[PDB]
Amino acid sequence: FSEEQTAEFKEAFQLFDRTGDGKILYSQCGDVMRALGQNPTNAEVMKVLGNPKSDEMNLKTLNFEQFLPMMQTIAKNKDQGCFEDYVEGLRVFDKEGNGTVMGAEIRHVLVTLGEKMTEEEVEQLVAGHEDSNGCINYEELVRMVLSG
Amino acid sequence: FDQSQIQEFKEAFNMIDQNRDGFIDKEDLHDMLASMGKNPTDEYLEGMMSEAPGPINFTMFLTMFGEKLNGTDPEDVIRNAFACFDEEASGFIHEDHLRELLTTMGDRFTDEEVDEMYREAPIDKKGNFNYVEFTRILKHGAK
Amino acid sequence: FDQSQIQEFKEAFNMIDQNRDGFIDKEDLHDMLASMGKNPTDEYLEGMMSEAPGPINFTMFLTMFGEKLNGTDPEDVIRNAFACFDEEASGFIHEDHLRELLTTMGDRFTDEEVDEMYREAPIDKKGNFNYVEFTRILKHGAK
Amino acid sequence: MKVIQRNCAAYLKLRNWQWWRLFTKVKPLLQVTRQEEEMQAKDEELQR
C-alpha cells in the first residue's frame, strides 16, 4: 500500500520484538495483525504464512519486509463477518429470546466450537458484563467488540 | 532543575561549607567525615575536587550534580508507573518476575542489572519485592 | 548525637547567627539579649567565647554541647523508668520519699542533691511530687 | 516501564559514584522542609 501509515506500522512492528531488530514470531506477528484492526481467522493466516506447522510458527519469526505483502493478502479479504450476523445469531442462540444470552453456554460454545480459545480468553472477554441472571446483553458486548 | 532539589543541595552545601566562602576545600569534607568517622584519604578528596575546575564553588557542584542527575524522575511518578504495573496495587511484585521482564522490556537487559538489584534490594525469601520504600530509597528516602 | 537534637540546635543557631556567617560573635547574642532585656556584660560574652577555639562556629558549639550533653536520655525513657517506680502510675510520688531513696539508691547521695531538687521542683504542700511536667522541664518542656 | 528503566539506569550510573555516599550521609540531617511537609501530611492524615 502506502507509506502513509507505514510509520505506525513500523513502530508497532518493532514495538513487540523480543530481539529489537525486526524479527517477530509468527504467532506474535499474527497477534499484531489482529491488533491492527485486521483480525482474520488463523486458518487464512497459516494459508498466507506458507502453511507452516505449530513448531515453525513458534520457532520462525518474520522480517518487516515480508510483513507488507502479508498484510496485503490480509487486506484482500476486504471484509469480515458482519454485525447483523452476530446480533441475529446470538439472538437466535438464546433459549427464550429475553434480550440477553446466558453466560456459561456462551463460554462453552466459544471455547468448544470452531476456532479454539482458552477459557480465560472468553472469561476476560465476558468479564465485567456479568449479571446475577447470568444472561448478558449480547448487543452491547458485540458492538463493543466490533467497534473496538 | 527542580526547586526542591536545588534548595536542598544549596542547603547541604552551606551547611558543609564550614568556611562559608562558597568554596569547598579539603577542610570541609575532611572534618565532616572525621566527625562522622574515619577521616577520608586525601587522594579521595583530590579526586572529588578533580571534577570541578578548582575549589568546588556553588554553581560548580550545582552543574555537576545536574549533569549527573538531570534525566531521572521523583519517586512519585516512579511508584505511579509501578502501580498499574501490578494488579494487586499493594507494591509486592516478585523479583524473579522483575528478572523475566527486564531481559526484554523494550531494549534487552543483561544479568548484571538483576544481580545488583537483588543484592541491593529488600527482597523476601521467595522473590516478592516491595517498592513502597525501595523506590524512596532510590530517591534517597532512607539510603 | 540525635537527629532531633542536632536539627533544633542548628535551627536555633542559624536563627541567632544574625550575620549568617556561621560565626557566632558578640553582636548576635548581645542584640538578642538586648531585644530580650538587659544587655549581657561583655565579660559574660567573652567567657562564653572562651570554650570555643574562636568565634563560635557551627561544629564548635555542636561538639561543645555534645560533650556537655551526650550521656543523658529523653523524657520518654525518663518517665518510663518513673512509671514502674510508682504503683499508682499517676506520677505523684512524694519528694521526701525521693529523699529517703536517693541517699542510698545504688551509690550514696548527699543532701545538696535533695535540697536543690526540692527548691527547684513543683512539690506540693506535703511532699508529693509530679514528674509528668517536671521531667519534661528537665528536657526543657517549659524551662 | 521505560520511565522506570531510565530511572534505574541513571541509578546504576550513579549508585557507584563516590560523591554519593558523601552527600547522602548529610541529607538526613537537615529536614526543615521535611519537618514542615510531614507536619501538614500528618495534619491531613489525622483529619482523615
GROMACS .gro file of C-alpha atoms in nm:
model
  482
    1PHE     CA    1   0.000   0.000   0.000
    2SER     CA    2   0.131   0.339   0.108
    3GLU     CA    3   0.395   0.482   0.339
    4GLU     CA    4   0.115   0.696   0.485
    5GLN     CA    5   0.050   0.458   0.777
    6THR     CA    6   0.371   0.255   0.735
    7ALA     CA    7   0.532   0.469   1.007
    8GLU     CA    8   0.279   0.350   1.264
    9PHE     CA    9   0.317   0.004   1.110
   10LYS     CA   10   0.693   0.015   1.169
   11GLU     CA   11   0.671   0.140   1.526
   12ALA     CA   12   0.413  -0.126   1.610
   13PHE     CA   13   0.619  -0.397   1.439
   14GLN     CA   14   0.936  -0.309   1.630
   15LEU     CA   15   0.731  -0.247   1.945
   16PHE     CA   16   0.666  -0.619   2.000
   17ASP     CA   17   1.009  -0.752   1.902
   18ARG     CA   18   1.180  -0.977   2.155
   19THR     CA   19   1.513  -0.916   1.979
   20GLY     CA   20   1.458  -0.550   1.892
   21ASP     CA   21   1.562  -0.569   1.526
   22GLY     CA   22   1.256  -0.653   1.315
   23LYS     CA   23   1.210  -1.027   1.370
   24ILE     CA   24   0.883  -1.115   1.543
   25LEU     CA   25   0.742  -1.465   1.591
   26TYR     CA   26   0.465  -1.589   1.364
   27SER     CA   27   0.211  -1.617   1.645
   28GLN     CA   28   0.320  -1.274   1.766
   29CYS     CA   29   0.301  -1.113   1.422
   30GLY     CA   30  -0.046  -1.256   1.369
   31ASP     CA   31  -0.142  -1.112   1.707
   32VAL     CA   32  -0.007  -0.774   1.596
   33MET     CA   33  -0.204  -0.801   1.271
   34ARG     CA   34  -0.521  -0.868   1.470
   35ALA     CA   35  -0.434  -0.573   1.695
   36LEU     CA   36  -0.412  -0.364   1.376
   37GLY     CA   37  -0.784  -0.400   1.308
   38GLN     CA   38  -0.712  -0.672   1.053
   39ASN     CA   39  -0.823  -0.975   1.258
   40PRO     CA   40  -0.871  -1.280   1.035
   41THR     CA   41  -0.900  -1.641   1.143
   42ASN     CA   42  -0.573  -1.826   1.198
   43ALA     CA   43  -0.676  -2.052   0.908
   44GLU     CA   44  -0.615  -1.793   0.637
   45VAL     CA   45  -0.319  -1.670   0.844
   46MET     CA   46  -0.144  -2.005   0.806
   47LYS     CA   47  -0.268  -2.016   0.446
   48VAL     CA   48  -0.072  -1.696   0.375
   49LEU     CA   49   0.200  -1.799   0.624
   50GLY     CA   50   0.322  -2.057   0.373
   51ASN     CA   51   0.113  -2.321   0.552
   52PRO     CA   52   0.362  -2.388   0.833
   53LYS     CA   53   0.323  -2.614   1.136
   54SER     CA   54   0.294  -2.515   1.501
   55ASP     CA   55   0.665  -2.579   1.556
   56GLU     CA   56   0.760  -2.346   1.271
   57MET     CA   57   0.509  -2.090   1.398
   58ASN     CA   58   0.674  -2.088   1.742
   59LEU     CA   59   1.034  -2.101   1.613
   60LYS     CA   60   1.033  -1.893   1.292
   61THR     CA   61   0.988  -1.516   1.306
   62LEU     CA   62   0.933  -1.266   1.024
   63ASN     CA   63   1.105  -0.954   0.894
   64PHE     CA   64   0.922  -0.630   0.828
   65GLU     CA   65   0.985  -0.666   0.454
   66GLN     CA   66   0.764  -0.973   0.410
   67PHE     CA   67   0.521  -0.820   0.659
   68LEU     CA   68   0.398  -0.575   0.394
   69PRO     CA   69   0.277  -0.838   0.141
   70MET     CA   70   0.138  -1.028   0.439
   71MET     CA   71  -0.098  -0.750   0.545
   72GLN     CA   72  -0.156  -0.702   0.172
   73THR     CA   73  -0.301  -1.053   0.148
   74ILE     CA   74  -0.489  -0.981   0.471
   75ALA     CA   75  -0.641  -0.673   0.308
   76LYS     CA   76  -0.755  -0.894   0.019
   77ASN     CA   77  -1.030  -1.024   0.248
   78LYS     CA   78  -1.174  -0.670   0.225
   79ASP     CA   79  -1.448  -0.765   0.476
   80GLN     CA   80  -1.525  -0.993   0.769
   81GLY     CA   81  -1.835  -1.121   0.946
   82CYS     CA   82  -2.099  -0.852   0.968
   83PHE     CA   83  -2.261  -0.704   1.278
   84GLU     CA   84  -2.612  -0.817   1.188
   85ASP     CA   85  -2.473  -1.171   1.163
   86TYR     CA   86  -2.352  -1.165   1.522
   87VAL     CA   87  -2.658  -0.997   1.669
   88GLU     CA   88  -2.908  -1.226   1.496
   89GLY     CA   89  -2.705  -1.540   1.563
   90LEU     CA   90  -2.670  -1.459   1.932
   91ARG     CA   91  -3.039  -1.364   1.949
   92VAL     CA   92  -3.140  -1.699   1.797
   93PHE     CA   93  -2.879  -1.875   2.010
   94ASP     CA   94  -3.057  -1.791   2.336
   95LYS     CA   95  -3.329  -2.021   2.470
   96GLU     CA   96  -3.620  -1.778   2.507
   97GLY     CA   97  -3.536  -1.450   2.332
   98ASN     CA   98  -3.516  -1.248   2.655
   99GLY     CA   99  -3.298  -0.964   2.521
  100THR     CA  100  -2.991  -1.144   2.658
  101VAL     CA  101  -2.791  -1.466   2.632
  102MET     CA  102  -2.685  -1.699   2.913
  103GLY     CA  103  -2.320  -1.682   3.008
  104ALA     CA  104  -2.198  -2.035   3.073
  105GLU     CA  105  -2.343  -2.161   2.745
  106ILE     CA  106  -2.163  -1.879   2.563
  107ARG     CA  107  -1.832  -1.962   2.730
  108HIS     CA  108  -1.872  -2.330   2.644
  109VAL     CA  109  -1.978  -2.283   2.281
  110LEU     CA  110  -1.695  -2.035   2.240
  111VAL     CA  111  -1.411  -2.246   2.379
  112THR     CA  112  -1.550  -2.569   2.227
  113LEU     CA  113  -1.654  -2.467   1.876
  114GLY     CA  114  -1.469  -2.397   1.552
  115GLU     CA  115  -1.167  -2.190   1.645
  116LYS     CA  116  -1.046  -2.299   1.987
  117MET     CA  117  -0.962  -2.045   2.256
  118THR     CA  118  -0.860  -2.085   2.619
  119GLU     CA  119  -1.114  -2.037   2.896
  120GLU     CA  120  -0.956  -1.719   3.035
  121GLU     CA  121  -0.972  -1.563   2.687
  122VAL     CA  122  -1.352  -1.570   2.674
  123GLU     CA  123  -1.353  -1.513   3.052
  124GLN     CA  124  -1.186  -1.172   3.039
  125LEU     CA  125  -1.393  -1.118   2.725
  126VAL     CA  126  -1.719  -1.152   2.920
  127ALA     CA  127  -1.562  -1.020   3.241
  128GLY     CA  128  -1.724  -0.704   3.376
  129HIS     CA  129  -2.051  -0.760   3.190
  130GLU     CA  130  -2.167  -1.041   3.420
  131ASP     CA  131  -2.502  -1.027   3.598
  132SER     CA  132  -2.691  -1.221   3.863
  133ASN     CA  133  -2.921  -1.355   3.591
  134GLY     CA  134  -2.620  -1.492   3.403
  135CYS     CA  135  -2.780  -1.351   3.086
  136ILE     CA  136  -2.561  -1.081   2.935
  137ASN     CA  137  -2.689  -0.831   2.680
  138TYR     CA  138  -2.517  -0.964   2.369
  139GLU     CA  139  -2.580  -0.638   2.183
  140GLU     CA  140  -2.358  -0.410   2.392
  141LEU     CA  141  -2.069  -0.657   2.403
  142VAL     CA  142  -2.086  -0.738   2.031
  143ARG     CA  143  -2.092  -0.372   1.934
  144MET     CA  144  -1.805  -0.304   2.174
  145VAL     CA  145  -1.603  -0.585   2.014
  146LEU     CA  146  -1.690  -0.471   1.661
  147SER     CA  147  -1.613  -0.104   1.724
  148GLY     CA  148  -1.322  -0.199   1.950
  149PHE     CA  149   1.639   2.173   3.751
  150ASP     CA  150   1.392   2.142   4.039
  151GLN     CA  151   1.314   2.386   4.319
  152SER     CA  152   1.319   2.125   4.595
  153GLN     CA  153   1.637   1.965   4.463
  154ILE     CA  154   1.829   2.291   4.419
  155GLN     CA  155   1.718   2.424   4.756
  156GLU     CA  156   1.821   2.110   4.942
  157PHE     CA  157   2.152   2.092   4.753
  158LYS     CA  158   2.243   2.450   4.842
  159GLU     CA  159   2.121   2.388   5.198
  160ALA     CA  160   2.352   2.090   5.244
  161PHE     CA  161   2.632   2.286   5.077
  162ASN     CA  162   2.612   2.592   5.300
  163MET     CA  163   2.590   2.352   5.594
  164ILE     CA  164   2.905   2.169   5.481
  165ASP     CA  165   3.090   2.486   5.371
  166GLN     CA  166   3.228   2.534   5.722
  167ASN     CA  167   3.415   2.841   5.595
  168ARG     CA  168   3.101   2.995   5.437
  169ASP     CA  169   3.320   3.117   5.150
  170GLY     CA  170   3.126   2.929   4.884
  171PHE     CA  171   3.449   2.739   4.810
  172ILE     CA  172   3.452   2.373   4.910
  173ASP     CA  173   3.801   2.272   5.021
  174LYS     CA  174   3.961   1.967   5.182
  175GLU     CA  175   3.892   2.115   5.527
  176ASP     CA  176   3.514   2.096   5.497
  177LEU     CA  177   3.455   1.737   5.388
  178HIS     CA  178   3.763   1.624   5.582
  179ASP     CA  179   3.642   1.745   5.921
  180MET     CA  180   3.285   1.644   5.835
  181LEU     CA  181   3.383   1.282   5.774
  182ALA     CA  182   3.614   1.298   6.077
  183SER     CA  183   3.314   1.393   6.291
  184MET     CA  184   3.126   1.115   6.110
  185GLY     CA  185   3.407   0.862   6.144
  186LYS     CA  186   3.731   0.762   5.972
  187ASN     CA  187   3.889   1.061   5.801
  188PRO     CA  188   3.892   1.042   5.420
  189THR     CA  189   4.220   0.978   5.244
  190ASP     CA  190   4.331   1.300   5.076
  191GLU     CA  191   4.353   1.125   4.739
  192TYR     CA  192   3.977   1.073   4.757
  193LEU     CA  193   3.938   1.444   4.833
  194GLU     CA  194   4.158   1.538   4.537
  195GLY     CA  195   3.964   1.307   4.306
  196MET     CA  196   3.642   1.468   4.425
  197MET     CA  197   3.799   1.807   4.352
  198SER     CA  198   3.911   1.681   4.009
  199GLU     CA  199   3.565   1.720   3.852
  200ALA     CA  200   3.525   2.089   3.938
  201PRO     CA  201   3.763   2.342   3.777
  202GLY     CA  202   3.903   2.423   4.121
  203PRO     CA  203   3.775   2.465   4.476
  204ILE     CA  204   3.420   2.341   4.435
  205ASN     CA  205   3.203   2.651   4.417
  206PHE     CA  206   2.824   2.667   4.447
  207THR     CA  207   2.731   2.663   4.078
  208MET     CA  208   3.019   2.420   4.021
  209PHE     CA  209   2.866   2.127   4.208
  210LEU     CA  210   2.523   2.257   4.103
  211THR     CA  211   2.610   2.194   3.738
  212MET     CA  212   2.798   1.873   3.814
  213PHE     CA  213   2.508   1.714   4.003
  214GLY     CA  214   2.275   1.843   3.733
  215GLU     CA  215   2.467   1.678   3.450
  216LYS     CA  216   2.500   1.366   3.665
  217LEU     CA  217   2.132   1.369   3.769
  218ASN     CA  218   1.918   1.555   3.513
  219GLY     CA  219   1.713   1.281   3.348
  220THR     CA  220   1.575   1.094   3.648
  221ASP     CA  221   1.225   1.124   3.796
  222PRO     CA  222   1.095   1.163   4.152
  223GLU     CA  223   0.958   0.866   4.344
  224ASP     CA  224   0.601   0.985   4.286
  225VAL     CA  225   0.591   0.904   3.915
  226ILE     CA  226   0.815   0.603   3.983
  227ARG     CA  227   0.555   0.440   4.206
  228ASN     CA  228   0.290   0.568   3.964
  229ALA     CA  229   0.443   0.365   3.681
  230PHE     CA  230   0.480   0.086   3.937
  231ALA     CA  231   0.110   0.099   4.030
  232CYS     CA  232  -0.054  -0.008   3.704
  233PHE     CA  233   0.245  -0.245   3.667
  234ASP     CA  234   0.079  -0.463   3.934
  235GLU     CA  235  -0.287  -0.559   3.957
  236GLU     CA  236  -0.279  -0.606   4.334
  237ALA     CA  237  -0.169  -0.240   4.374
  238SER     CA  238  -0.001  -0.330   4.705
  239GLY     CA  239   0.354  -0.295   4.572
  240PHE     CA  240   0.463  -0.656   4.625
  241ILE     CA  241   0.572  -0.782   4.284
  242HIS     CA  242   0.820  -1.068   4.263
  243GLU     CA  243   1.186  -1.002   4.190
  244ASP     CA  244   1.225  -1.304   3.962
  245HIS     CA  245   0.924  -1.167   3.777
  246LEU     CA  246   1.127  -0.845   3.751
  247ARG     CA  247   1.410  -1.056   3.608
  248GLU     CA  248   1.196  -1.234   3.350
  249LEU     CA  249   1.056  -0.898   3.239
  250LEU     CA  250   1.378  -0.694   3.244
  251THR     CA  251   1.558  -0.923   2.999
  252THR     CA  252   1.343  -0.798   2.710
  253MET     CA  253   1.141  -0.499   2.834
  254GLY     CA  254   1.189  -0.253   2.550
  255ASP     CA  255   1.561  -0.291   2.494
  256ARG     CA  256   1.734  -0.609   2.607
  257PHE     CA  257   1.892  -0.609   2.953
  258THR     CA  258   2.175  -0.823   3.085
  259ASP     CA  259   2.235  -1.014   3.410
  260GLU     CA  260   2.446  -0.757   3.598
  261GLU     CA  261   2.137  -0.538   3.640
  262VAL     CA  262   1.927  -0.809   3.802
  263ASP     CA  263   2.204  -0.945   4.023
  264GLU     CA  264   2.291  -0.596   4.151
  265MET     CA  265   1.922  -0.525   4.211
  266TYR     CA  266   1.867  -0.844   4.409
  267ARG     CA  267   2.187  -0.794   4.610
  268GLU     CA  268   2.080  -0.434   4.683
  269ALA     CA  269   1.706  -0.463   4.747
  270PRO     CA  270   1.496  -0.589   5.042
  271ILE     CA  271   1.356  -0.893   4.864
  272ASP     CA  272   1.161  -1.152   5.060
  273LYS     CA  273   1.258  -1.519   5.087
  274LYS     CA  274   1.070  -1.634   4.774
  275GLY     CA  275   1.103  -1.346   4.526
  276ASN     CA  276   0.842  -1.091   4.628
  277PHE     CA  277   0.979  -0.736   4.616
  278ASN     CA  278   0.840  -0.422   4.779
  279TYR     CA  279   0.899  -0.081   4.624
  280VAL     CA  280   0.690   0.145   4.852
  281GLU     CA  281   1.013   0.208   5.046
  282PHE     CA  282   1.271   0.078   4.799
  283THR     CA  283   1.180   0.337   4.536
  284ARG     CA  284   1.201   0.607   4.803
  285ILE     CA  285   1.546   0.468   4.885
  286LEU     CA  286   1.622   0.512   4.515
  287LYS     CA  287   1.519   0.875   4.568
  288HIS     CA  288   1.712   0.868   4.899
  289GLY     CA  289   1.434   0.817   5.149
  290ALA     CA  290   1.649   0.601   5.374
  291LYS     CA  291   1.969   0.543   5.173
  292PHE     CA  292   2.412   1.251   6.857
  293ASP     CA  293   2.039   1.270   6.784
  294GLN     CA  294   1.858   1.390   6.473
  295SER     CA  295   1.601   1.599   6.660
  296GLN     CA  296   1.864   1.749   6.890
  297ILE     CA  297   2.111   1.839   6.614
  298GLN     CA  298   1.838   1.981   6.391
  299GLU     CA  299   1.696   2.203   6.665
  300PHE     CA  300   2.044   2.315   6.772
  301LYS     CA  301   2.139   2.419   6.420
  302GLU     CA  302   1.795   2.578   6.379
  303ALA     CA  303   1.840   2.795   6.687
  304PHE     CA  304   2.195   2.873   6.578
  305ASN     CA  305   2.109   2.993   6.228
  306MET     CA  306   1.828   3.193   6.387
  307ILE     CA  307   2.069   3.355   6.634
  308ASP     CA  308   2.354   3.395   6.381
  309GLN     CA  309   2.217   3.732   6.272
  310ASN     CA  310   2.513   3.763   6.033
  311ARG     CA  311   2.452   3.417   5.877
  312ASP     CA  312   2.830   3.373   5.858
  313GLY     CA  313   2.833   3.061   6.074
  314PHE     CA  314   3.050   3.256   6.320
  315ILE     CA  315   2.885   3.349   6.649
  316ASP     CA  316   3.017   3.685   6.769
  317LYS     CA  317   2.933   3.929   7.047
  318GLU     CA  318   2.688   4.107   6.815
  319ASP     CA  319   2.448   3.813   6.786
  320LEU     CA  320   2.389   3.716   7.149
  321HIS     CA  321   2.432   4.079   7.256
  322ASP     CA  322   2.149   4.217   7.043
  323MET     CA  323   1.941   3.905   7.110
  324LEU     CA  324   1.953   3.956   7.487
  325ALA     CA  325   1.903   4.330   7.432
  326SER     CA  326   1.579   4.253   7.249
  327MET     CA  327   1.503   4.010   7.532
  328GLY     CA  328   1.601   4.253   7.807
  329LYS     CA  329   1.911   4.375   7.989
  330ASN     CA  330   2.215   4.355   7.764
  331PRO     CA  331   2.475   4.097   7.872
  332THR     CA  332   2.800   4.220   8.021
  333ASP     CA  333   3.076   4.165   7.766
  334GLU     CA  334   3.278   3.961   8.017
  335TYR     CA  335   2.998   3.703   8.009
  336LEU     CA  336   3.018   3.704   7.629
  337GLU     CA  337   3.396   3.656   7.639
  338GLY     CA  338   3.363   3.371   7.888
  339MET     CA  339   3.107   3.209   7.660
  340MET     CA  340   3.354   3.253   7.373
  341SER     CA  341   3.631   3.106   7.590
  342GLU     CA  342   3.518   2.746   7.540
  343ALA     CA  343   3.529   2.753   7.160
  344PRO     CA  344   3.868   2.800   6.988
  345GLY     CA  345   3.747   3.133   6.848
  346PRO     CA  346   3.427   3.281   6.707
  347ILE     CA  347   3.183   3.002   6.786
  348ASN     CA  348   3.132   2.813   6.461
  349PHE     CA  349   2.861   2.558   6.386
  350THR     CA  350   3.052   2.238   6.463
  351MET     CA  351   3.220   2.423   6.751
  352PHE     CA  352   2.910   2.457   6.967
  353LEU     CA  353   2.787   2.129   6.819
  354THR     CA  354   3.080   1.945   6.977
  355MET     CA  355   3.069   2.153   7.295
  356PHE     CA  356   2.701   2.081   7.362
  357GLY     CA  357   2.765   1.720   7.268
  358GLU     CA  358   3.045   1.675   7.520
  359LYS     CA  359   2.835   1.865   7.775
  360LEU     CA  360   2.517   1.669   7.696
  361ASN     CA  361   2.599   1.327   7.547
  362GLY     CA  362   2.502   1.082   7.819
  363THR     CA  363   2.152   1.198   7.910
  364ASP     CA  364   1.823   1.044   7.797
  365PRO     CA  365   1.499   1.192   7.658
  366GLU     CA  366   1.196   1.241   7.879
  367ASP     CA  367   1.027   0.935   7.728
  368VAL     CA  368   1.255   0.678   7.891
  369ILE     CA  369   1.279   0.905   8.197
  370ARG     CA  370   0.906   0.880   8.264
  371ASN     CA  371   0.929   0.513   8.161
  372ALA     CA  372   1.173   0.443   8.443
  373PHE     CA  373   0.947   0.662   8.657
  374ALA     CA  374   0.637   0.457   8.571
  375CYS     CA  375   0.723   0.121   8.727
  376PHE     CA  376   0.887   0.326   9.005
  377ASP     CA  377   0.533   0.402   9.129
  378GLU     CA  378   0.245   0.158   9.165
  379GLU     CA  379  -0.023   0.425   9.123
  380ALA     CA  380   0.122   0.510   8.777
  381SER     CA  381  -0.017   0.864   8.809
  382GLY     CA  382   0.322   1.029   8.857
  383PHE     CA  383   0.263   1.166   9.207
  384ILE     CA  384   0.538   1.019   9.423
  385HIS     CA  385   0.643   1.202   9.739
  386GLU     CA  386   0.958   1.414   9.745
  387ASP     CA  387   1.060   1.304  10.094
  388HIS     CA  388   1.022   0.951   9.962
  389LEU     CA  389   1.262   1.061   9.688
  390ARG     CA  390   1.495   1.181   9.964
  391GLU     CA  391   1.482   0.859  10.166
  392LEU     CA  392   1.553   0.662   9.848
  393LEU     CA  393   1.822   0.886   9.696
  394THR     CA  394   2.050   0.863  10.000
  395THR     CA  395   2.139   0.501   9.917
  396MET     CA  396   1.997   0.421   9.571
  397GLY     CA  397   2.291   0.247   9.408
  398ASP     CA  398   2.570   0.481   9.510
  399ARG     CA  399   2.523   0.703   9.814
  400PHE     CA  400   2.391   1.055   9.755
  401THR     CA  401   2.433   1.364   9.970
  402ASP     CA  402   2.198   1.642  10.087
  403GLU     CA  403   2.279   1.907   9.824
  404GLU     CA  404   2.101   1.699   9.560
  405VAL     CA  405   1.775   1.674   9.754
  406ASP     CA  406   1.773   2.035   9.872
  407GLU     CA  407   1.836   2.164   9.519
  408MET     CA  408   1.566   1.933   9.384
  409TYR     CA  409   1.307   2.049   9.637
  410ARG     CA  410   1.397   2.415   9.587
  411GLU     CA  411   1.370   2.366   9.208
  412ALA     CA  412   1.067   2.140   9.169
  413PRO     CA  413   0.688   2.197   9.191
  414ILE     CA  414   0.636   1.991   9.505
  415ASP     CA  415   0.300   2.001   9.681
  416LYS     CA  416   0.249   2.111  10.042
  417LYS     CA  417   0.308   1.768  10.199
  418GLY     CA  418   0.578   1.604   9.985
  419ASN     CA  419   0.400   1.469   9.678
  420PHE     CA  420   0.595   1.539   9.360
  421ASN     CA  421   0.473   1.531   9.000
  422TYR     CA  422   0.710   1.447   8.716
  423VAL     CA  423   0.473   1.438   8.416
  424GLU     CA  424   0.573   1.801   8.355
  425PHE     CA  425   0.882   1.828   8.575
  426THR     CA  426   1.072   1.566   8.374
  427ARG     CA  427   0.973   1.747   8.055
  428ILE     CA  428   1.112   2.062   8.218
  429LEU     CA  429   1.430   1.861   8.273
  430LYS     CA  430   1.421   1.802   7.897
  431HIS     CA  431   1.321   2.169   7.854
  432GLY     CA  432   0.948   2.141   7.805
  433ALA     CA  433   0.879   2.465   7.990
  434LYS     CA  434   1.218   2.562   8.139
  435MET     CA  435   0.848   0.057   3.210
  436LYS     CA  436   1.069   0.284   3.001
  437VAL     CA  437   1.029   0.557   3.262
  438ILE     CA  438   1.126   0.315   3.540
  439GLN     CA  439   1.404   0.190   3.312
  440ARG     CA  440   1.560   0.532   3.257
  441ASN     CA  441   1.536   0.595   3.631
  442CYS     CA  442   1.705   0.271   3.739
  443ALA     CA  443   1.970   0.303   3.467
  444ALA     CA  444   2.053   0.651   3.595
  445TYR     CA  445   2.069   0.500   3.944
  446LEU     CA  446   2.309   0.236   3.809
  447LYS     CA  447   2.527   0.510   3.661
  448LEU     CA  448   2.506   0.689   3.998
  449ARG     CA  449   2.490   0.417   4.264
  450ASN     CA  450   2.869   0.382   4.246
  451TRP     CA  451   2.993   0.742   4.215
  452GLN     CA  452   3.199   0.825   4.523
  453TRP     CA  453   3.023   1.157   4.587
  454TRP     CA  454   2.700   0.969   4.657
  455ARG     CA  455   2.780   0.818   4.997
  456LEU     CA  456   2.928   1.155   5.095
  457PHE     CA  457   2.631   1.375   5.009
  458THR     CA  458   2.381   1.111   5.123
  459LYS     CA  459   2.527   1.095   5.473
  460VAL     CA  460   2.431   1.461   5.517
  461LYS     CA  461   2.075   1.470   5.376
  462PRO     CA  462   1.902   1.307   5.679
  463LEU     CA  463   2.041   1.587   5.898
  464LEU     CA  464   1.861   1.889   5.750
  465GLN     CA  465   1.486   1.828   5.739
  466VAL     CA  466   1.318   2.167   5.791
  467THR     CA  467   1.125   2.131   5.466
  468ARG     CA  468   1.076   1.765   5.555
  469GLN     CA  469   0.961   1.865   5.904
  470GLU     CA  470   0.705   2.111   5.767
  471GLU     CA  471   0.574   1.883   5.491
  472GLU     CA  472   0.540   1.598   5.739
  473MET     CA  473   0.353   1.833   5.973
  474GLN     CA  474   0.094   1.906   5.705
  475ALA     CA  475   0.084   1.543   5.590
  476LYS     CA  476   0.016   1.427   5.945
  477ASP     CA  477  -0.246   1.703   5.974
  478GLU     CA  478  -0.442   1.573   5.676
  479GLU     CA  479  -0.384   1.212   5.787
  480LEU     CA  480  -0.520   1.284   6.135
  481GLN     CA  481  -0.817   1.464   5.980
  482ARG     CA  482  -0.889   1.165   5.754
   0.00000   0.00000   0.00000
